[PDB]
Amino acid sequence: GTSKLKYVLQDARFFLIKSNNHENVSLAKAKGVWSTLPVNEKKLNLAFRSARSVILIFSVRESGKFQGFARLSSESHHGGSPIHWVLPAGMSAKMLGGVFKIDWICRRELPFTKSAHLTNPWNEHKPVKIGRDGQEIELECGTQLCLLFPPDESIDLYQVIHKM
Ligand SMILES: CNc1ncnc2c1ncn2C
């Protein structure tokens, strides 16, 4: 079913994550963490305080797909055991030093061809696949985008609901 998923997405906020490489999304899925540039770090920390759920929706650049979505379970935190991100050019380890814990809601992929009917009012009504890293996605678009993903039957949202 999909009722707990809908409950988690109730009045959530959604942010588009654009990763320049697959390796970091794979690491994120394994280790339950994410890091972004300081400008986005600040926005996510603010939104983590503002909403029942903050949802990250991941797409690797040039893949033509989303690779899944996850819910922030913490604010960012610096200085722990370093995450071995593959660093994009011009991006230093210090720039990515803030670590968010995340709980994955879906690790299955969705091709851009299946979301062509969803546009994002916070990005000039462009298709929701289009957007810079950190672009916020409007509630109705974001909900519908998440509900398009194939079910991830490996996930139990019972714990995530307890965190809300
Ligand atoms: C682990 N964070 C990241 N990895 C790869 N690329 C990124 C990232 N953040 C923003 N961009 C463009």
Curated annotation (Swiss-Prot):
Cite the binding residues for RNA: 18-20, 34-35, 85, 133
Give a short account of its post-translational modification.
Tyrosine phosphorylated.
Q: What is the effect of changing residue 132 to A?
A: Reduced binding affinity for N6-methyladenosine (m6A)-containing RNAs by 100-fold
Q: Name one GO biological process term.
A: dosage compensation by inactivation of X chromosome
Stated consequence of mutating residue 18 to L:
Does not affect ability to influence alternative splice site selection
Q: What is its main location?
A: nucleus
Task: Give GO cellular component annotations, separated by semicolons.
Answer: nuclear speck; nucleoplasm; nucleus; plasma membrane
What keywords sit in the KW lines? Isopeptide bond, mRNA processing, mRNA splicing, Nucleus, Phosphoprotein, RNA-binding, Ubl conjugation
Phosphoserine: residues bearing it: 81, 92
Listed result of changing residue 133 to K: Does not affect ability to influence alternative splice site selection
Substituting residue 95 to A results in: Reduced binding to N6-methyladenosine (m6A)-containing RNAs
Effect of mutating residue 104 to D: Does not affect ability to influence alternative splice site selection
Instruction: Indicate the impact reported for residue 37 to T.
Output: Reduced binding to N6-methyladenosine (m6A)-containing RNAs
Upon changing residue 58 to D, the result is:
Does not affect ability to influence alternative splice site selection
The reported result of mutating residue 68 to I is:
Abolishes RNA-binding and ability to influence alternative splice site selection
The subcellular localization recorded is: Nucleus; Nucleus speckle
A Gene Ontology molecular function term of the record = mRNA binding
State how changing residue 19 to A affects the protein, per the record: Does not affect ability to influence alternative splice site selection
Domain (YTH) spans: 12-149
Q: According to its UniProt entry, what is the function of this protein? A: Regulator of alternative splicing that specifically recognizes and binds N6-methyladenosine (m6A)-containing RNAs. M6A is a modification present at internal sites of mRNAs and some non-coding RNAs and plays a role in the efficiency of mRNA splicing, processing and stability. Acts as a key regulator of exon-inclusion or exon-skipping during alternative splicing via interaction with mRNA splicing factors SRSF3 and SRSF10.
Q: How does it assemble?
A: Interacts with SRSF1. Interacts with SRSF2. Interacts with SRSF3. Interacts with SRSF7. Interacts with SRSF10. Interacts with CPSF6. Interacts with KHDRBS1/SAM68. Interacts with TRA2B. Interacts with KHDRBS3. Interacts with EMD. Interacts with RBMX. Interacts with ZCCHC8.
Q: Print the domain comment field.
A: The YTH domain mediates RNA-binding.
Q: What is the protein named?
A: YTH domain-containing protein 1
User: Which species is this UniProt entry from?
Assistant: Homo sapiens (Human)
